[PDB]
C-alpha cells in the first residue's frame, strides 16, 4: 500500500541524516568500500540499510547492549527515581487524604499509594486526553479526580525550615482550545505541630491540592541500615597485558 512507502522513505531519510551528522556512525573503510562504485557515501549506506530490512542474520548481544537494556528497563519500572510519575490526583483541601507521614513534611503531597476509595466512594479516573477535551471542568473539579494515561514530570525542593507547602505554579490552565496541567514544582517544608499561623494559612489560603505517589528515592534516617550495600573488587595482584600477541616478527 502507498503511504507505507511514503513512511518508509521518510524514516530512511531521517535515519540517514541522523547517523551521518556529527561523528559518523560508520567507519571510513566501510564508506570507502561502499563508495568505490561511485556513490556519494550517503547513498551507498542508504541502499545497504534498505537492503538489510527484515533480515535473518544472527547478531550477538554485547555487554554494553545488556547494560543499556538493564538501565532502560529499570528506568521504565521505577519511575519515581527519575522525576516522573504515571498518575496524579487533584482534590480540594476540605477533603481529608491519607498521606505518608514517615518523613514529617507539613501537608505532604506524597501518598504511599493512590487511594482506591475515598470517603466510601471510588475515586474517578480520567485520561489526560479526555480531561483536555473537556469543557465542564468546574463540575468535575468540585470533587477531585485521578489523572492518568500520561507521564507527569515533577520536581520538589525540600526546605529545612517550616512553612506552607505549595506549588510554584497553578495546577490547571483553561484555554478555549483545551485544558492543560502546568509544570509541577513542590516547595516542601517541615512541620511544627503547634503553629496556629501556619495551620490557618494551610487550611484557608490553599483551596486545592495535588497528590503523587511517594518517591522511592526518599528514605527516612531511622531505617538507614537498608542503604548498606556491598561491592566486590578483584585482587590487586592481577597484572593486565595491553598487547596479548603471542609471537614476534622475524626481523
Amino acid at each position: 500500500t502507498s503511504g507505507s512507502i511514503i513512511n518508509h522513505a521518510n524514516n530512511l531519510n531521517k535515519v540517514i541524516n541522523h547517523v551521518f551528522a556529527d561523528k559518523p556512525l560508520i567507519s571510513e573503510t566501510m564508506l570507502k568500500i561502499l563508495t568505490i562504485d561511485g556513490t556519494t557515501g550517503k547513498d551507498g549506506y542508504r541502499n545497504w540499510l534498505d537492503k538489510l530490512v527484515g533480515h535473518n542474520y544472527p547478531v550477538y548481544v554485547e555487554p554494553v547492549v545488556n547494560i543499556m537494556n538493564f538501565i532502560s528497563a529499570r528506568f521504565v519500572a521505577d519511575s519515581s527515581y527519575f522525576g516522573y510519575t504515571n498518575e496524579i490526583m487533584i482534590m480540594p483541601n476540605h477533603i481529608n487524604v491519607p498521606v505518608d507521614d514517615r518523613f514529617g513534611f507539613r501537608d505532604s503531597p506524597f501518598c504511599t499509594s493512590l487511594p482506591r476509595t475515598i470517603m466510601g466512594n471510588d475515586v474517578r479516573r480520567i485520561s489526560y486526553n479526555v480531561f483536555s477535551m473537556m469543557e465542564d471542568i468546574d463540575d468535575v473539579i468540585s470533587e477531585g479526580f485521578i489523572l492518568y494515561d500520561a507521564y507527569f514530570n515533577f520536581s520538589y525542593d525540600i526546605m529545612t525550615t517550616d512553612g506552607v507547602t505549595r506549588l510554584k505554579e497553578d495546577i490547571l490552565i483553561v484555554t478555549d482550545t483545551g485544558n492543560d496541567i502546568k509544570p509541577i514544582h513542590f516547595y516542601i517544608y517541615f512541620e511544627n505541630r503547634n503553629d496556629k499561623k501556619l495551620r490557618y494559612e494551610s487550611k484557608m489560603n490553599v483551596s486545592y491540592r495535588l497528590y503523587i505517589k511517594t518517591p522511592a528515592c526518599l528514605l527516612p534516617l531511622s531505617d538507614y541500615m537498608r542503604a548498606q550495600h556491598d561491592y566486590v573488587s578483584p585482587s590487586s595482584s592481577r597484572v593486565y597485558i595491553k598487547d596479548p600477541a603471542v609471537v614476534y616478527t622475524r626481523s
Binding site: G3, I6, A9, N10, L12, N13, D43, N47
Partner: protein
Amino acid sequence: ACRDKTSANWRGYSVLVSRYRSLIPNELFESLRNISGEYNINPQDEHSFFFALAQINADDEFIGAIDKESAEYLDEYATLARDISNSLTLVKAAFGPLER
C-alpha cells in the same frame, strides 16, 4: 549500472506517482479512463533516462503522513464545481431556450 540506479531510486518515483495521483479528482480520473494513447520515445532519451536517473526526495514536503500542497490543490476542485453549477443555473435562467 541501470539495475543499480533503478534499485537505488525507486521509492522516490513511487512516491511521486502517488502524489500525482493524489492531485487528480475522482470524476476527472473516471473521465480519463475512456481515452487512450501511445507515447513514442527515442532510444537515446530512454537510455539517458535510465543511465542518469536523478534521485528525487520529498522528505521536506511531507509533515508526517500529511502533505499540504496536494490537499490544497485537491480542495480547490470543490470551489470549481460549485462555481460551475452556479454559473450554469444563472445562464439557463437568464437566457432560457436558445434558437439559431
